Ligand binder design. Structure first.
Ligand SMILES: CCNC(=O)Nc1nc(CO)c(-c2ccc[nH]2)s1
Length: 192
C-alpha cells in the first residue's frame, strides 16, 4: 500500500533532481554530503553525538560516520518495514546515488542494508556486534544524474566542514582524503 508511494517518490526525485538539490552540477554533487552531514549535526544538537567523520574514498565514494544513537531499526507498523529502510527509501541522497549503504550500530548490534537508486537490494541484516552506537552511510553519486562531474573538491569540503564545526561548537568534525593511498590528507576541526 505505502510501498507504492515510496516507489513513486523515487521516480519523482530522479526525474526532477534540480528541484530537490538546486542543480546537478558540481554544487549539487557536494550538496549530497551536506544533506547527510546535517542529519549528523541534528543528532549532536539533540545531545547524542560529538564526532562526525567525512572520508572521500577511492572512486569518489563518500563515507559519513557519527557516534550518535543509530538510525532506528524497529518495525514500522504502518509499512511492516524497519524504520531505517523507510527513512532511506525516502532519502534524496539515496535516490540520486547509483549505490549507497548503511551500517547502524545500535542494541549492541551492527545492521546493514544496501540500495541502488533508492531501491533496497536486500532486507536489513544483522552482520556483527558492537559496544558503540552510531551511523555510517557510504554512497556513490549517480553519474546518470551528475553529468558534469562526480569528483569532489577537498577545499570545497574542508571550508564548509570548518564553518560547520565553528557554527556548532563542541562537535569534532574530521575530513579525510583517501583517494590517493600514497598521500592521505586529514583536517580535523573542534571548537571548544
Ligand atoms: C551518517 C549520517 N548520520 C545520521 O543519519 N545520523 C542519525 N542518527 C539518528 C539517531 O537519532 C537518526 C534518526 C533518523 C530518524 C530517527 N533518528 S539519523
Amino acid at each position: 500500500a505505502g510501498q507504492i508511494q515510496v516507489l513513486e517518490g523515487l521516480e519523482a526525485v530522479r526525474k526532477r533532481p534540480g528541484m530537490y538539490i538546486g542543480s546537478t552540477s558540481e554544487r549539487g554533487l557536494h550538496h549530497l554530503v551536506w544533506e547527510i552531514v546535517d542529519n549528523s549535526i541534528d543528532e549532536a544538537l539533540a545531545g547524542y553525538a560529538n564526532q562526525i567523520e567525512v572520508v572521500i574514498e577511492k572512486d569518489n565514494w563518500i563515507k559519513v560516520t557519527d557516534n550518535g544513537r543509530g538510525i532506528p531499526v524497529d518495525i514500522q507498523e504502518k509499512m511492516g518495514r524497519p524504520a531505517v529502510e523507510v527513512i532511506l527509501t525516502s532519502s534524496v541522497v539515496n535516490a540520486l546515488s547509483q549505490d549507497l549503504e548503511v551500517y547502524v550500530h545500535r542494541n549492541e548490534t551492527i545492521y546493514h542494508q544496501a540500495y541502488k537508486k533508492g531501491v533496497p537490494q536486500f532486507d536489513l541484516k544483522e552482520v556483527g556486534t558492537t559496544d558503540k552506537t552510531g551511523t555510517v552511510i557510504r554512497f556513490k553519486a549517480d553519474g546518470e544524474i551528475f553529468t558534469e562531474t562526480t569528483v569532489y573538491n577537498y577545499e570545497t569540503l574542508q571550508q564548509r566542514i570548518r564553518e560547520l564545526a565553528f557554527l556548532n561548537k563542541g562537535i569534532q568534525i574530521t575530513l579525510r582524503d583517501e583517494r590517493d593511498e600514497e598521500n592521505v590528507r586529514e583536517d580535523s576541526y573542534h571548537y571548544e
